[PDB]
Paper text:
Lipocalins are a superfamily of functionally diverse proteins with remarkably conserved tertiary structure despite significant sequence variation. These ~ 20 kDa proteins form an eight-stranded antiparallel β-barrel enclosing an internal ligand-binding pocket. The precise biological function of some lipocalin family proteins is not yet clear, even for those discovered more than two decades ago. This includes the first bacterial lipocalin protein identified, Escherichia coli lipocalin Blc. Blc is a membrane-associated protein anchored to the outer membrane by a covalently bound N-terminal cysteine lipid, and it faces the periplasmic space.
However, we were able to determine the structure of wtBlc-split protein at 1.94 Å resolution. The wtBlc-split asymmetric unit cell contained three ‘split’ molecules that differ primarily in the area of the two β-strands adjacent to the split point. Two fragments of the split protein together fully reconstitute the typical lipocalin fold. During structure refinement, we discovered a well-defined positive difference density map area in the binding pocket of one of the three ‘split’ molecules in the asymmetric unit. Based on the shape of the density as well as previous observations including color of the protein, absorbance, and fluorescence spectra, we suggested the presence of the heme B molecule in the structure. The heme molecule occupied the same hydrophobic cavity of the lipocalin as it was previously showed for vaccenic acid. In the binding pocket formed by chains E and F of the structure, there are 19 amino acid residues containing atoms within a 4.0 Å distance from the ligand (Glu45, Phe53, Glu54, Leu57, Val60, Asn76, Lys77, Gly78, Ser89, Phe108, Tyr113, Gly114, Gly115, Tyr116, Val130, Pro133, Tyr137, Trp139, and Leu141). Phe53 and Trp139 form π-stacking interactions with the porphyrin rings IV and II. The side-chain hydroxyl of Tyr137 and backbone amide of Gly113 stabilize one of the propionate groups of heme by hydrogen bonds. There are two additional amino acid residues from the adjacent ‘split’ molecule in the asymmetric unit (Ser148 and Glu150 from chain D) that contribute interactions with heme at the solvent front.
Author numbering:
A (entry chain B): 112 to 175
B (entry chain A): 23 to 109
The structure:
């Protein structure tokens, strides 16, 4: 098991990241905190849609 | 290669990326399907790659599991494009 890992967007303070794999069927939202804001949520979704990712494929992962 | 057309961070500072990140959302694949409370932890190797540990809670096994990997940059370490091999 091996493959590409690409940080496609990252804020100035290294707190929020959009990471894709070797093609548009692989995408992740990463955060330094277990929950994020409605505002951060929409910016990440806007960027993914802009770069041709289908945001309908997202699963929202259970976090404490 | 990165997918055709996508942006890749081009002033990447790997040292500032190190430590723990929470997975907020994913496109679902069989390797992660069903795992909750997923974290990724990154540390710097002597040979200039990254060590990766992916942890999640598997409510079927009722257990914490992790997988470990080795990541290398495919070019400049200021270009956030890597290949990860799991073992």
């Amino acid at each position: 098991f091996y493959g590409g890992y690409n940080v496609i967007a990252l804020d100035r303070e290294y707190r929020h990241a959009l990471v894709c794999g070797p093609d548009r069927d692989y995408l992740w939202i990463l955060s330094r905190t277990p929950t994020i804001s409605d505002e951060v949520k929409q910016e990440m979704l806007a960027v993914a849609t802009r770069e041709g990712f289908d945001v309908s494929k997202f699963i929202w992962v259970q976090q404490p | 290669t990165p997918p055709r057309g996508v942006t890749v961070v081009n002033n990447f500072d790997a040292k500032r990326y190190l430590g723990t990140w929470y997975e907020i959302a994913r496109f679902d694949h069989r390797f992660e399907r069903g795992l909750e409370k997923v974290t990724a932890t990154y540390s710097l190797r002597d040979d200039g790659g990254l060590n990766v540990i992916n942890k999640g809670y598997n409510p079927d096994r009722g257990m914490w599991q992790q997988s470990e990997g080795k990541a290398y940059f495919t070019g400049a370490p200021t270009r956030a494009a890597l290949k990860v091999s799991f073992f």
